[PDB]
């Protein structure tokens, strides 16, 4: 069982969970903050080409350094030189770009 973790579990780790599901030989996601528990993934992140409920476990992968530190593991990124978090749509595609590289299997 693989668990992908970001801060609110509405943008990054929900994307990681679906990318990994598609790449997989067959995931879940959650968040360090429970402020968004029960919400659907961010409307902008579901919108794309590119199929994406927030919940707040120690499973058999952190999106940024704050999620990770400061079984636990961008260090599977092989092509693109964190998975970045108040932005326009281009930042959402970059998140997907990084997860298609990193998504490890």
Residue numbers in the entry: 2 to 25, 30 to 31, 36 to 59, 64 to 65, 68 to 71, 76 to 77, 80 to 81, 84 to 93, ...
What are the paper's exact sentences on this?
Most cyanobacterial strains produce extracellular polymeric substances (EPS), mainly composed of heteropolysaccharides that can remain attached to the cell surface (CPS—capsular polysaccharides) or be released into the environment (RPS—released polysaccharides). Wzc undergoes a phospholyation/dephosphorylation cycle that affects its oligomerization state and is dependent on the phosphatase activity of another protein, Wzb (Cuthbertson, Mainprize, Naismith, & Whitfield, 2009). In addition, Sll0328 was identified as a low molecular weight protein tyrosine phosphatase (LMW‐PTP; EC: 3.1.3.48) and Wzb homolog. Most importantly, Wzb was able to dephosphorylate Wzc in vitro, suggesting that tyrosine phosphorylation/dephosphorylation plays a role in cyanobacterial EPS production.
The structure of Wzb was solved (2.28 Å), revealing structural differences relative to other phosphatases involved in EPS production and suggesting a different substrate recognition mechanism. One monomer was present in the asymmetric unit, with the crystal lattice belonging to the P312 1 space group. Synechocystis’ Wzb displays the structure of a low molecular weight protein tyrosine phosphatase (LMW‐PTP). The PTPases signature motif, the PTP loop, with the characteristic sequence C(X)5R(S/T) (cysteine 7 to serine 14) is located between the C‐terminus of the β1 strand and the N‐terminus of the α1 helix, at the N‐terminus side of the protein. Opposite and topping this loop, there is the DPYY loop, which contains the functionally essential aspartate residue (D124). Together, the DPYY and PTP loops constitute the enzyme´s active site. The tyrosine residues of the DPYY loop form one of the walls of the active site pocket, with a histidine (H45) delineating the other side of the substrate entry site. Two features of the Wzb structure are particularly relevant for its functional properties: (a) it possesses the second Y of the DPYY motif (Y127) that is absent in most prokaryotic LMW‐PTPs (Bohmer, Szedlacsek, Tabernero, Ostman, & Hertog, 2013; Lescop et al., 2006; Standish & Morona, 2014). (b) Synechocystis’ Wzb possesses an aromatic residue—histidine (H45)—in the catalytic site instead of the hydrophobic leucine that occupies this position in most prokaryotic LMW‐PTPs. Based on these characteristics, Synechocystis Wzb can be classified as a class I or eukaryotic‐like LMW‐PTP and is therefore likely to present a substrate recognition mechanism different from that of E. coli Wzb, a class II or prokaryotic‐like LMW‐PTPs.
